[PDB]
Design a binder for this molecule. Structure first.
Ligand SMILES: CC(=O)NCC(=O)N1[C@@H]2CC[C@H]1c1ccc(Nc3ncc(C(F)(F)F)c(NC4CCC4)n3)cc12
Length: 274
């Protein structure tokens, strides 16, 4: 048992591992039924892990929303950093999609309404996430794992690559997962918040079809494909509802200037459909 302020965890209770973070399930020391996810340095990449966890704190301390994984507390010291986060009892969308293969349009709508809500807050604060992928979309059912799936709440996680972007500036750091990167990101161009909208379009397309809209053998191959193809049209299955078709087509615009803007996303007919 290690303690971080009012919370405790055992390194036995590993729930996830990446190059730059290790995450343990923990609990409040007084309210043992309050589950938490404790994110810790990966000492294999000490300096970068410490930097990214510190940036995550800096960003998440400004973001309170149902659909953003909550930061309950944190502890930054000279040689280590902890984040005590909301525990999402449903795990990640990558694993959920692996088991479900594809999601109904109604489930995609429920999830995307929640992602849109979180993105409204990021956009209003001037923050871009830059690492949206299914592994960073977490699921939580307030009625418990075995409850009605209509009750699944979605939370954006992993803000270590996030930044403020001034409205007259562009970003240029290579961030994210290549299969979810906007073309402008993987082509090492300048980009803005619309790069996240491409990532969201890729996630929605994967939910709908079970595959990438633009398949490639490697990140290098995907970059070459984007470089060579100045128009990108995803194949929309003919059973797709018109609002979801139009949402996908507008998000998966190769050129960020042509891509759906945030106001269009937040008010998209797909999101207000019954
Ligand atoms: C010991 C135990 O109870 N294990 C549960 C477990 O391993 N599960 C449960 C269901 C699938 C997998 C899993 C992964 C992640 C979560 N929850 C969660 N909540 C918050 C965070 C976060 F706050 F840290 F983001 C988080 N991050 C992990 C690292 C891989 C995704 N995971 C829950 C689970």
């Amino acid at each position: 048992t290690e303690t971080v302020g009012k919370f405790e965890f055992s390194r036995k209770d590993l729930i996830g591992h990446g190059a730059f973070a290790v995450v343990f399930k923990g609990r409040h020391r007084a309210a043992h039924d309050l589950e938490v996810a404790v994110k810790c340095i990966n000492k294999k990449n000490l300096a970068k892990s410490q930097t990214l966890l510190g940036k995550e704190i800096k960003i998440l301390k400004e973001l309170k929303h149902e659909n953003i994984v909550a930061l309950y507390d944190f502890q930054e010291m000279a040689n280590s950093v902890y984040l005590v986060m909301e525990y999402c009892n449903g795990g990640d969308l990558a694993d959920y999609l692996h088991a479900m293969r594809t999601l109904s349009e109604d489930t995609i709508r429920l999830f995307l309404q929640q992602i849109a809500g979180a993105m409204r807050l990021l956009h209003s604060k001037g923050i871009i996430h830059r690492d949206l992928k299914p592994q960073n979309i977490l699921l939580s059912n307030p009625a418990g794992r075995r409850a009605n799936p209509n009750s699944i709440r979605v939370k954006i996680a992993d803000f270590g690559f996030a930044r403020y972007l001034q409205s007259n500036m562009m970003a240029a750091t290579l961030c994210g997962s290549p299969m979810y990167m906007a073309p402008e990101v993987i082509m090492s161009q300048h980009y803005d918040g619309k790069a996240d909208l491409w990532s969201i379009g890729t996630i929605v397309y994967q939910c709908l079809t079970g595959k990438a809209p633009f398949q490639a053998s490697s990140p290098q191959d995907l970059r070459l494909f984007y470089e060579k193809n100045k128009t990108l049209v995803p194949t929309i299955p003919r059973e797709t509802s018109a609002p979801l078709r139009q949402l996908l087509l507008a998000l998966l615009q190769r050129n960020h200037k042509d891509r759906m803007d945030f106001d269009e996303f937040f008010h998209h007919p797909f999101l207000d459909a019954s």
